[PDB]
Structure formats: structure tokens, C-alpha cells
Amino acid sequence: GPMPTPRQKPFQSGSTPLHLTHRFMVWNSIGIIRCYNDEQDNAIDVEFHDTSIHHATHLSNTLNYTIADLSHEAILLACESTDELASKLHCLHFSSWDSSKEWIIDLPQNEDIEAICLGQGWAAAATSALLLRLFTIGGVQKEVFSLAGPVVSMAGHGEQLFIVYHRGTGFDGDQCLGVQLLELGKKKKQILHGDPLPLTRKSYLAWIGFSAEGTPCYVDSEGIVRMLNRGLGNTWTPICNTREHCKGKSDHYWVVGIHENPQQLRCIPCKGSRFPPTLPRPAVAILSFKLPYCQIATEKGQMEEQFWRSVIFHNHLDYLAKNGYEYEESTKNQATKEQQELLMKMLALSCKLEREFRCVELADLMTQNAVNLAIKYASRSRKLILAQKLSELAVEKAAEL
Amino acid sequence: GPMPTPRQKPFQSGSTPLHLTHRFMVWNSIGIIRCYNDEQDNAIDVEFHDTSIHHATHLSNTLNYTIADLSHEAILLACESTDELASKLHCLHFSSWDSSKEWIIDLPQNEDIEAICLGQGWAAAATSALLLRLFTIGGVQKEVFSLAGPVVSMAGHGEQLFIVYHRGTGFDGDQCLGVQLLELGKKKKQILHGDPLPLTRKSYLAWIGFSAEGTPCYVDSEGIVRMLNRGLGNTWTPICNTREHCKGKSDHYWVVGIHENPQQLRCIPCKGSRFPPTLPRPAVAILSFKLPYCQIATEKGQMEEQFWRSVIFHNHLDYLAKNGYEYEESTKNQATKEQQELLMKMLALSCKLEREFRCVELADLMTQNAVNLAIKYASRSRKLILAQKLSELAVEKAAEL
Amino acid sequence: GPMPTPRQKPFQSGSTPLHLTHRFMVWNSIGIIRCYNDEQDNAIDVEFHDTSIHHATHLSNTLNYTIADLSHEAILLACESTDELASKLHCLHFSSWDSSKEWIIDLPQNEDIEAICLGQGWAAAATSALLLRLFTIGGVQKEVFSLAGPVVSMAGHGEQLFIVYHRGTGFDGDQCLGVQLLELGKKKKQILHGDPLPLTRKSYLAWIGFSAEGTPCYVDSEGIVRMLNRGLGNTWTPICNTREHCKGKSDHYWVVGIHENPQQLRCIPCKGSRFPPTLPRPAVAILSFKLPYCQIATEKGQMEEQFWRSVIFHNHLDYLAKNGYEYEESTKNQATKEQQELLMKMLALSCKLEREFRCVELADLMTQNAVNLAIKYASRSRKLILAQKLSELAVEKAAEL
């Protein structure tokens, strides 16, 4: 019969394989951590993206760390549970008010760290006992809970903690993963509470994290980037099949990060290997998103892609408004005006195509000012039926606005 | 040892398999869509149950429109991706006033289709890439999101969408199915977050859909009708073992529609098969539901079954009311009247049995007017302790209210 | 490679195996039910820990009941179906005011009860049709719905109904279990609606139930006790490792009850066996709960583990107050006082360690009135930056307040 797929070993997002004599511990927007290791010595460097965060710093890998993660508040490290020493979690809170910026924790006996991440104001790790441990940046042990399966990876941004694990057994080459998403805020909540994780056929998970604006996203082995549509009931929307940015199967991409505004994907181009060449220091490439949409060669399909790209990449403004962070409303005004002008162009093209019911549907998707301009567009060429029905739809909108 | 179950192939909701010269591609409450295919052409025939919806219509193409759906506003068809054509969706928005009396849209390369459905001004389709495509019925591309697994079937009604897919790996004949439901009104919501789908042991899903009053329902291969009981925090209540009816004289009762006002299952009696042949014209058998309540030979059990069947069906009126749609208060009043009468009559039966605690328990399920009538009955029958307990219940309810 | 596991058969909490001649059918906080079959008689003995509740009861086991549950309100019994007689549900509502304290129900033909449980005024039964049936404690049939898989066990407390089932097939020793937690109160809800249930590796589920204070809890075959953390988004927090408490690690404890205030784990030690013998009668041992924190022998570890233990246990006060159940305000006063004096001592230790950012992180959990004491403590010995930043924290808390 069909075989069960082997579960993929856990990874740190943006990292590189352990065995490389030089490797990148993690690529991230704050600063690049890299390591040299061989049969007789081992050392770690951190190379900050902006030196105003902190100057570049170097350490000897005294306790043989194998995992790490960075934020602009602190840098974390973690090691294996050796026979002489169980797994240790280490931190330099380099941005602290106090000079006692270093601290370390050692797990109970026969327990090993499998993943580690940072947010803002907290740290987190997932261990070999299917047990997740929260900490503060200064190393107070916060609450603890058990995971439903072995962890694949984890990430964080602000009060958001993202975990992905093996919810079950994969079959005939496909993996079987689930996702938890926790709010470590004023009220502890769990928007995703073990839901299944979509993946491309016979693929495996390759990268996770958040955009710089705090929206969760991930990439699988086929390069299809998916992002959490918070508008459509917290569901995973694809945003880029990165294979089309490649010259072919010769190339892969290793994501450094994603920016929801400006609409950018930042990654290392890699040839042959999925992970980049370890030396010399590679240069980061930047790519543009295009949502996978049908008939995209046509201008109407292209602007449909532009519209849904605009709203999906300004969902973060709604999330910022809800969570209480500072943001500028001019961004939402720009997004609404741009996507409503695009919707105006679609309505004009549909009107010229005589698909006036499609114009009324587009006007249902419109804001009131755009419906008024659509009524004027329907008045051009004297299409009175469409103009009357657009006016009626405007009245219906006014009844609720 | 244990054996993995093979995943079943997808089916369009309410359709026959492709292994016959003539098929029902969809049979809704609206009407029937047939397909006859041979070496000459593929002939699609639409027959409305009421011609006031629209007249009988016929299409014919070399394209094999392998998937179909029907609604009061429009007809919908779709065809698979071939070695030279990508998939295409086809529609006839017959109710329209513009030039959208026909519409065709492509889908990308390798975007093979499994199932499609219709909504109030909406349309939807599932892809072999595990992306759900959403559209307006006039034909704008709406949002896209990633499906958690291979979809087995799909359905729609109003502003709500119902999806069933393969959640994991089955074993020993059981199929590991998951269910997802979304609502797309003013606030876009996700009711079922990818939860498991109950099924009879070693059964396979045979039909899904909505009741005509707008709640999801489905039937498995053993003939067990189930529906999403939203009076129980959205759990699956079984309603009918269709193999019972007419002492199982027909080897199957191929469901085509469900109603609860009146209480009517619409189905086709099938002899020696799970589905009927498309010609000669099968007759619609109408069957009444029978919930699987215990000790059904007794008056007590029959009154219980009547009461709970009534309340699960007439709970839909409150759902329709609170979600902002039109509903009928006379039917709600009749439902309440029958429920109070059933509780009163079975209270009298339990009084005859001297099971006064059952009488108080039944009084908990009815209003203050019925409780006062029961108190006066208790006074007439000189059951003072029963009257006192009912009076204490009335005092507690009045203090709470 | 991996191999599928045999999904374990259903069980009942505090039972011992059916093959025994003389066994416990249930042992809980209420009392004990024993059953035996020998040449002298086939019978069931019910007895209560507090004899004021009800006298010891004895029943001839002619119908061969096999599953049982005990509550303050009633005794509930069930049997597997044989060929001539169906599976039957039997109840003794001894706390009733009417003389007809017994009632009996007979299930549909070849339907078979596989688990039962009791609650405040209701009873539940899970059957071989993957069907859960609700009854009033006086035997009126309440609502019916389909389970997502074969059950393993059930439990009830007040309005809460806790169900665990097989959501799938496990591999490589593990069991694939899902948890479903209903509330049957004034509005029907699902707190957990099929979430995966954590387990230790290669374990099986050994015990389920509620604390006396009404929080769901369970124990796996590796002796790890887990409780539902309602203050952390309804995740699962381990609260005790019974293996560390044993005289020798080959032996293990058999749980019968849980209490949060006082913190008690009620269990029976077993000499070389999974469960205790029925005679000579076991003695219930008390074990203290222990969160699995790191560096737990240090003063930091002692303080923080006690803090988190205290707060996760005193979540039940919040649940009771939110759902309208009465409670003594002295419990909340004592909980807040203990937590605050403890965290004041922890603040003193972090202050003397001169980690003032850790002090701010610790004091973030506190009320500003209590943070004023830490401000004065920082003023003592002139820890100026610590005093200033605790003052800023108090000002921010007052600004939010």
C-alpha cells in the first residue's frame, strides 16, 4: 500500500544546515548571525543590518550553540542536551536599561531545545518533550504548555507567537503539519489553535515568520509564499509562486524577510542548493509580489491582481488599529484611493464591455465616492439603466453608512 | 495489520459518475442539468422545475463540461485542464438584464478542477493546486486562499460556503475527512475551522448540500442523513437512516434535496445501485425524517423524538432572523405551540407514571404560561408537591428574567 | 520505517480491567462502585466515602453491567449489547424526591454503549454508532449528535461535558487523540471542538476528569498530569510528574481525583501494576502538584514555579465568577495576596541581583499599589534607576487604569 511520509526534522527559519563548516545561523531583517565551526574550533558573529541597533559583535562558541534568533531587543542562542550538560538557553539583552545584560537557563534532565524564537517583550522555546516554555527578555520563566505534536519551527512578532508542528502522519510523500498562533497580550488568546497547514503536493515546509508589519506568512519547498488573510476569516492566501522569478530549476531562493509595505520579498538567490553559498558574503535580492490569479496576461486580470494585492497588503493597518499600535492613516487613505481607482478602471472596462451587472458588482465592492464616480461613468455614453441601478446601490449603501 | 484507506475521488454535489453515456451533472431544487456525451458532441441540457425561473435550455460543445451547478440567478459549468487547454468555467446568468447571459473564464495552467458551487451573487471553485477560487456571478475574480487538502465536494447557499476535503490518512476503510465553512457577509467569518467530519464506520461521503432553508447537510454511503446543528454549538445531528424507509425495499434512496418547511427529504429510489440511470425519467420519492431516538415504540419516546425533531428544524428560523434575513413569525409561533403542547402531554404521561421528577424536568423546557397551566393541572389532580416544585421553578425563572 | 499503532479500546476513569473476577467499576471523589462475578453471586456494590450522602447499595448483576459512573445525584450503569438484548442504560437517581428513583432505557437494535458519564442534572452516553446521546438525570432524552471518531472516555462536571476520541491513526507508539469539550448550559457551546490532545511519546491516555473546582484534567500512561489553562487561551499545562514521586520508578500511581484549593492530587500507589488490586482495600495517597520549570531548586525557580502554580490553579475562580457560579471572595483575596507577597520577595531578590529590567518585567505582573512597595524597596539602598523605572511602570499602569 501507499507509504507513510517521513516527518521533516525541525529547523530554525532562515537558517542553514548545521554541518557546514561556515554557516548562516539565521538571516533576518534586524541583523545576520553567522558561525564558523570545524573539528577543533567554533565561533559566532552577529552582523547588524543597522549599526544604530548595536555594533557588530563576535563570540567564541564556548557552549556549542546550534540555534539562535534575533530581535532589536535581544539575541538568543541554544545548544544540545549533552550527557555532561542538558540543553541551555542563552541570551544577551543588548538593548537593556541595566548592565547585567547576559543570562542563561538550563533545561531539566534529558530535555533538549528543538526550536527558539523572539517577539517583543518575550522569548519562547520548544523542547524535545513536546513542551513549549515561554520566557521574558530578561529571563523570567513565563507560562508553559504542551504541544500536540513534535515542533517543526516557531517564530514571533510583537505579542504574536507562531508555532508549526506535525499534527499527524504524512502519506505518499506529502507532509502533515498543523499551526498554532498565540496572542501573548493583555488577554491571552489563541486565534489558531492547532489548525491544519496547507502545503503544495508532495512538498515540505521551508520558511516561516512574519512580515515586518506583523502579518504571519510561510513558504514551502515549492516556493509558494502564503500569508494570513486576516480579513477572510484568518485563512492562508498565496501571494507569490517564487519559481517564476527563477531562471529555472537551476535556482532557488532563501527568504531573508518580507515587507507588507513596501510590497517586497527579500531573499538570497541560490544555485543548485536550496540554501545559499556560505562564502563569500552573499548579496540580498529583492522581488515583487504577484498574487496567483487567472487570465493575468490580460489587463483586467492584471489589475484584479493589483486590487487584491493592495487590500491583502494593507490588512496590516486593520490589525494595527485593532491591537493598538501606532500607525498613520494616510497609508490606508492611499491604499483605498489606489484600489478604488483600479476598481473604477475595471468598472469602466466592464461598462465598455456591456457587462453592466459586473459593473454593479464592482460598485458593490466600491466605496460610496467611487460609486458616485461610477454613476458618472455610466452617464457617459448615456447608459441610463446602469446609472439608475448604480444610484440605487448608492442609496442602499447610504442606508447603512 | 492495519491498512491505509485510499482517498475517494471528488464528486460534484448531487451528481452521477462519468461511467454512463448520460449523466445528471447536478440536480438542485432549481432544476436538473444533464450531460450526454458521445463521439459526436457533449450535449448539456438544463431543465428548470419551474419554468418561471427560466425556460428549458440546451447547450452543446466539444468541450466536456464535467462539473455543473444551478441557482435561481444563474447556471454554472466547468471543464478540466487537458494536454492543450487549461481549465475553463462557464456560466449563464439568465436572470440578468445586461449582456451577461453568458460568461466564460479561464484558469491557469495545471489548474485542474474538482468541484464548483454558487452563492447569492457569488461563485466558487476548487483547484488541483489546492487553491479555492472565488468569483462574482457576473464574473469578477474575488479572493483566493489555500485549501488544507484535496477537496471531495463543495456546496453553497446565500452568503455562506460549505467545503469538505480529505483531512489526513484513513485506515481500515474509514476515510479521514475534514469540513470547512465560511460566511461572506458584511463581516467575513469562518464557522468551522477545518474540523473533522463524522461518518459511519467504513462509510464514504455520498452527498452534501444545504437544506432549502439554508443550513448544511450531508449523507454518507450508509444512508445516514446529518446536518450542522447550530442549536448545539455547531455539531452534527443525525436525522435519518434512509435505508430504513419502506423497509429498505430500494437498495438506495439517492438524495437530491432537503427541506424542513415542510419536513421533506427529496430522493430517488434506486434498485441495485447507489445512483439512478439518467433515463428513463426517475421519480422523486418524498420521505419524512425519523431521528434515532431510543425506545421509539413508546409514546414517551415518540413525544421526545417529535419534540427534538421539531426544535432542531425550527431553530433555523432564529438563525435566519439573527443573521439579518427575512423569516416567518407565524411558523415560529406554531413551532413554539407544538413544542409546549408536546412538553405538556408528556408531562401528563409522566404524572400518570408517578415520575414527578420528569414532570419538573419537562417544565424546565417550557415558558411561564405553560408552567402555570401545568401548575393548574397539578392543583386539579391534587399533586401538591409537583405544584410546589413547578411554582418554585416559576419563581426562579421570574427572578432571573 | 514507522508503523501504525493499535488505537486503544475505550475505558472509564477509575475503573480496573473487565477480565477480573472482582474489580472497581469507578473510583472518584464521590465513592466507589465494585462489581464481581463468582459462584456465590453476580452483583454490584456501591459505596460512598461520606456516608451522609447515601447508604451503601447492592444490585444483582443479572443484566451484566460493565460501565458505571457515580455522582452526588445518581448512579449510572450501562452494559454491552448481546444477541437477544440490546445495550441498555440504567440509572438510580437516589437523590430524587419521588419514589420512582429508578429508570431504564434500551438502545436501538445492535447499537452498543461504549462509554458513559454523569453531570449536574444530566447523563451522557457514547455508543458504537459514533453517536453521543444526552439524557436528563430523570431519563428524558435530550439532544443527540455524532462524534468525530471512536470515543476513548468521557467525563462531566456541572454544565461541562468532556469527551476524548480517536481523531486518526497514530504511528510509532503514539496515539492520535482529539478532545471535544461541550458546555450544556443556558447557551450551548464548544470550548474545544476537536482539538488535538497532547501526549508524551509512545504513551496512551490513562485517566480523564475534572478538578473538584471544575477544570478539565487528564493523565497519560507516563504519569504526566495536565490541566486546562483557561488563563492561557485554553491550552494544556502540565502540573505534575507522578513518576518522580514514586518509591521506585517501576511502580506508579493510579489517579482518582484532583483538587486545586488545597492543591492535592488524589491517587493510589500500585506495587508492580498499572492499577490497584480490589482487595485488600487501597489507601488514597496525596501528592503535591509541581510545575516542570527549570532551575527549580533555586530561589528564582521556587518562587516563579509557585507563582505560576498559584495563578493557573486560581483560574477556576475566574471561570466560576464569569459563568455566575457563587464563590467566596476570600479565595480571590488569598490568591492575590499570596501571589503579590511572593512576587515582592522575588522583586527583592532581583533587586539585590541588580537586574532592574528583570525587576520591571517581574513587576509588570503586579498591581501598582504593590509596585509602590517595590519602589520604596528600591529607594532603600539607593537603587535609583530601579526606583525610577518602577515608578514609570506604576505611572503607565495608572495611565491604563
Quick take:
This is part of a larger assembly, with 3 copies of chain A (401 residues). The first copy, chain A, has 401 residues and is α+β, with helices and mostly antiparallel strands.
Task: Give a topology summary.
This is part of a larger assembly, with 3 copies of chain A (401 residues).
Chain A lengths: L21 E5 L4 E7 L4 E7 L8 E4 L4 E6 L4 E5 L8 E5 L9 E5 L6 E6 L4 E5 L3 E5 L5 E6 L4 E7 L2 E6 L12 E7 L3 E9 L8 E6 L5 E5 L3 E6 L5 E7 L9 E9 L4 E8 L13 E3 L11 H14 L2 H9 L5 H24 L3 H10 L2 H12 L4 H17 L1
Antiparallel strand pairs in A: 1-2, 2-3, 3-4, 5-6, 6-7, 7-8, 9-10, 10-11, 11-12, 13-14, 14-15, 15-16, 17-18, 18-19, 19-20, 21-22, 22-23
Helix pairs in contact in A: 1-3, 3-4, 3-5, 4-6, 5-6
Describe this entry's structure for a reader.
Chains A, B, C: One of its GO terms (cellular component) is nucleoplasm. This is part of a larger assembly, with 3 copies of chain A (401 residues). By secondary structure, chain A is of the alpha+beta class. Chain A has helices spanning 299-312, 315-323, 329-352, 356-365, 368-379, 384-400, and strands spanning 22-26, 31-37, 42-48, 57-60, 65-70, 75-79, 88-92, 102-106, 113-118, 123-127, 131-135, 141-146, 151-157, 160-165, 178-184, 188-196, 205-210, 216-220, 224-229, 235-241, 251-259, 264-271, 285-287. In chain A, strands 1-2-3-4 form a 4-stranded antiparallel beta sheet, with no helix packed on it. In chain A, helix 3 (329-352) runs parallel beside helix 5 (368-379), helix 4 (356-365) packs parallel to helix 6 and helix 5 (368-379) packs antiparallel against helix 6 (384-400). Chains in contact: A-B, A-C, B-C. Chain B binds chain C through residues 1-2, 4, 168-169, 171, 176, 193, 195-201, 226, 229, 231-238, 291-296, 301, 304-305, 308, 312, 353-358, 361-362, 385, 389, and chain C through 3-4, 6, 93, 96-100, 103, 105-108, 121, 129-131, 133, 136-149, 167-169, 178, 182-183, 188-190, 193-194.
